[PDB]
Amino acid sequence: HCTPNSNHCW
């Protein structure tokens, strides 16, 4: 689970 606010988030 990545944060949608990071560029490295898928």
Q: In this structure, how many other beta carbons lie within 10 angstroms of the beta carbon of residue 5?
A: 6
Give Cβ neighbours of residue 3 (< 8 Å, ≥ 6 apart).
9
> Which alpha helices (H) appear in 1-10, and where do they start and end?
none
What Rg, from alpha-carbon coordinates, does the chain have?
5
Chain centre to alpha carbon of residue 4: 4
Method: NMR
Q: Are 8 and 1 in contact (CB under 8 A)?
A: no
The CA distance from 1 to 7, in Å, is: 13
For residue 4, the one-letter residue type is P
Q: CA 5, CA 10: separation in Å to the nearest integer? A: 10
> Which residue has 């990071």 as its token pair?
6
Three-state SS annotation for the chain:
CCCCCCCCCC
